[PDB]
Design a protein around this nucleic acid. Sequence first.
RNA 1: GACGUUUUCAUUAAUCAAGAACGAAAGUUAGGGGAUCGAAGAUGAUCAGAUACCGUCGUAGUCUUAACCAUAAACUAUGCCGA
RNA 2: UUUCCAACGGGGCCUUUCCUUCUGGCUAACCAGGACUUUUACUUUGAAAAAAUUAGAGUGUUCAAAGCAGGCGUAUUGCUCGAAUAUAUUAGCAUGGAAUAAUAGAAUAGGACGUUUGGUUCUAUUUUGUUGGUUUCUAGGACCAUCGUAAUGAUUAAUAGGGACG
RNA 3: UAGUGGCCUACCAUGGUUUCAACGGGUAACGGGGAAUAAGGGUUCGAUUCCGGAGAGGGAGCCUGAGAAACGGCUACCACAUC
RNA 4: AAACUGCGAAUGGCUCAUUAAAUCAGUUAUCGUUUAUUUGAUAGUUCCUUUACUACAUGGUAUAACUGUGGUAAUUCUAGAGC
Lengths: 144, 188, 155, 260, 17
Amino acid sequence: GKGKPRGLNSARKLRVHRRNNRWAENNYKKRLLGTAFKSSPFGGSSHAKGIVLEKLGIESKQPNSAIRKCVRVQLIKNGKKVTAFVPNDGCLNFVDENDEVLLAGFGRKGKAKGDIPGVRFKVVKVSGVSLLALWKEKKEKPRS
Amino acid sequence: GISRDSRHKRSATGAKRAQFRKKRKFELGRQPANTKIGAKRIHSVRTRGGNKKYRALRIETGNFSWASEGISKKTRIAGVVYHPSNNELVRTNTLTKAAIVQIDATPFRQWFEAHYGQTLGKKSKNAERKWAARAASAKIESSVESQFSAGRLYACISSRPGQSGRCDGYILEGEELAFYLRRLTAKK
Amino acid sequence: STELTVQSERAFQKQPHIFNNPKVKTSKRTKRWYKNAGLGFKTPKTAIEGSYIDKKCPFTGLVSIRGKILTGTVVSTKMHRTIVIRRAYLHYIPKYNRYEKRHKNVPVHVSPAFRVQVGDIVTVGQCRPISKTVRFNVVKVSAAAGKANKQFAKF
Amino acid sequence: ARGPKKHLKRLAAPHHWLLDKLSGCYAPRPSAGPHKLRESLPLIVFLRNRLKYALNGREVKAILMQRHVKVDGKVRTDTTYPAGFMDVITLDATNENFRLVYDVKGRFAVHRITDEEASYKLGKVKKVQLGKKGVPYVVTHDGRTIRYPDPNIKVNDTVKIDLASGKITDFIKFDAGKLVYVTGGRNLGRIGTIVHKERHDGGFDLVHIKDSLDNTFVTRLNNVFVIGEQGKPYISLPKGKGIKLSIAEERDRRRAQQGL
Amino acid sequence: PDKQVSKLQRKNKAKQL
RNA sequence: GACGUUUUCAUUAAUCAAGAACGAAAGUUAGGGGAUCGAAGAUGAUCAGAUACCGUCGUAGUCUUAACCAUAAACUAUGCCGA
RNA sequence: UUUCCAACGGGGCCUUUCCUUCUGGCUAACCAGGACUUUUACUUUGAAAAAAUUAGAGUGUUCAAAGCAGGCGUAUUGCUCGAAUAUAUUAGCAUGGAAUAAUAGAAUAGGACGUUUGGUUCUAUUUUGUUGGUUUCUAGGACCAUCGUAAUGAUUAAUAGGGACG
RNA sequence: UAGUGGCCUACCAUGGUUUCAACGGGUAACGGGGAAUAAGGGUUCGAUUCCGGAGAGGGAGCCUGAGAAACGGCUACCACAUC
RNA sequence: AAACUGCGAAUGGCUCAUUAAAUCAGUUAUCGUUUAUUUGAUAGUUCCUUUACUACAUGGUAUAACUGUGGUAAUUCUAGAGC
């Protein structure tokens, strides 16, 4: 009988049956409780800009072997402190602390590209000016 | 704004209804007329479509009609002696629809003594037949007769003195006078 | 209960504007207005030959029949001059190509001409709004008990 | 929403006006009068863009404030005036005169006519009743209240009403064989000698109706419109006579007949 | 006591923020 | 329970939300004996962690009486009526 | 299209296959008229399903995306094609279809074929004489006294259960 | 009341809804054609040019009028806030 | 010109916070109800004694703009008189 009712009055069961088994699916429970709204410091966004707090202290969740020139940042739409990242790395010279970024994930909402805790967000545009025409030696690549 | 909307109620499962739109003008309810005896100021009111309604607060005089005969006389009341809905209303002497009143006899008996030739209470050769050819026709009921000696009858009201301006009584008789005299001795 | 000579209320129940003639007393002795209900309904012979009044009776009172007519079975006659029917039906769901048992309770006024029991089969018609819940009025009683008057006296 | 409406949006017009989707934002909402809002066809939808005697609205009102056009024997002068079904339009132009009866498409067209039948009009007597001072009267479909009719005329028949003064001249009963015309629903602009009635106490009354090519269809009875006998219309019906050719045989008429 | 931070239609009360 | 029957009901039926009985070992209150060994424990151990397996007494417990509990690898690791 | 051989369809009718009774138009073709060889679940054909979206003629917007537009000579003062249809289940409203599932008649035979008979509720379209107190025979329903009617009611005892007894 | 009505009101009756899920709670919920889809079914979204509903900062309230509980109308409260 | 009068200003435009048998959608019903407008039809009886105190050869007021004396810190504030 394959563990299920079939008879053509039993739909009362079935749409109450799957109703209690959608919660075993992962993104269903993630979605319909507003957990992306009660958490996830973007708050369901796609980008966020915020001041750089400071230079970052490396705590090994493996592996990229250097002090990765990363930036402690704290946003301004929320104010929730996240460790960040710059690609084309190096050039630690060209913006102070308490200065602007534009953040965006790594590809999995980040979670792993180097040995740094919670580093999941590529910086896109510091202070409104870009990085890709600023690693292109038109402008210059920032510091923390 | 006394609304007569249904959505302020509690639905029959017991559920409280959530709040919908603001109150409306097309679903309005006004004050009671609460119409009484002694003078007349009939405040007309203005309704939807122009369509004026009168409202007979202080009604005094009305076209009351005794049904078993077929004649309708302007008359004036003593007061009320019974009210079906609320027994407050006899104290205030409240006229409404379907109250029970005691009305004047003198139009009815001034018609009776000149039309019947019975002349109860107390013109040439053709016109005695008006008083003589009513064989078995000049007989009112004995319980109808006793109200004439007091000079005040028993009548009920079929008008809307809140919504028409009028008071049109009908003189109670027979079966229904027996019922409201059963109740009337029990309440008055 | 009501004790025909039906005027147990504070106000004389009568047919409105129907006038039992008190001066002439003759071989009439019954002034009872009644109407057809429409739609091919046999009127109940209580209503022709009864003393009850019932303003909202579709045979003697100021209501009418329109639009809808609905079957069902009685339940809970513990109110006065009204019953409640409950209609069962099968809701449909196309996710599973299947059905679902549901029911609805209709509070419907009943006449004093008919006399019913919880478990009979009713046919009602729509009327003007009577109370909050009631929009219907009992008009045919298809009681299908099965003739148990002397059925226990069996061979 | 706080009383009536005064604007009709473009795309909220009925489809039988056949306004173009672009070139504007609104529709010329018909005024109240002798017809429904939903099957009105006002004056400017007739003039400027189905006859093209005017190019835009100010030139339409140039006609209408010059007392030329007539709608059923009077000198109607309003732009959004609902000259609807059966209304004769007479011009004081080069004197070409028109009717208002649909095609089979459920849409009005240009139909020029004679002067035998420009003189009068018709109407489904939607009510016969006994009004004041005990006077019988009849109410046709548009607005007319004709007094003192034939008492053997009942509801759902039709009349032959004049335009000079509103005088009923003759009528048509309701039975089978009656050449008919539908006003509403789906089979709008059809024709074809009623088969029979269906009573249905308290409900709709539908009717079974043939056509010329013997193709039955069932309307409702509040759209049936009896105007004849076995092949006897009382107007001059347009080219095509209302019988529904299918879209397979207008790619055989417009494509295989006029297209060689 | 009760970890009862639910019923946040008065999350709109935190338009206080 | 099986089996036999040319006895009686003539569909009284399958599982199962809710609900109800029972329930190893162990454990839980109030009693009987108190023979047997014996989780803990009191002793002797006894040399480094050949390894700490040894040994001896042991309150309760094991056995039952008026009651619980409602736990197993309660496992043939396989729900119950059909072919 | 004259058409020999077989084949796919439903009907008129028939081998108890009732396909009914009801009679004016009538000498059942079909139209009023009294009952269905039971009521729901199901499905089949209509009707309602706004216009804008989605599918497509036709149109050289230069192809297009678009748009519903437009084409033709002696251009001699005009002629003339259009602007379809498809779709949208439940719910609601109409009829067959005759399985499926449901609901069970007639175990009293206090029931049908009762074309039957005393008697009960009856009775006025009436004809009565024009209209209302006093009546019948009488058109149209029901049962007791009551029996005449054809073929008068027990679908099974389950390799499904419950008993007895051995 | 424009009118049905527990819409009130005066006396009565003790009902009504529900595990066929009442009631309560949450919605980052304005409802209907649309979208991404594309074997089919399913999935998620729909503030948005059209229809219907609602509001003119939040709740009340009333006038004129056929029509408004109207805010490029009015009175008051509440939150603001100009010379 | 202005001003009286009338109609318009209840349409449009915007926004989606509310709202979960609510809205809305399809279907109903009003034998329970209002409706300016439009269109069609519709007042011999109006001195309510039409036996009259009459003016129907048409009877009265009240006023804006016009004017001409002004105040306001400031408003589309308005005052006093004469038409």
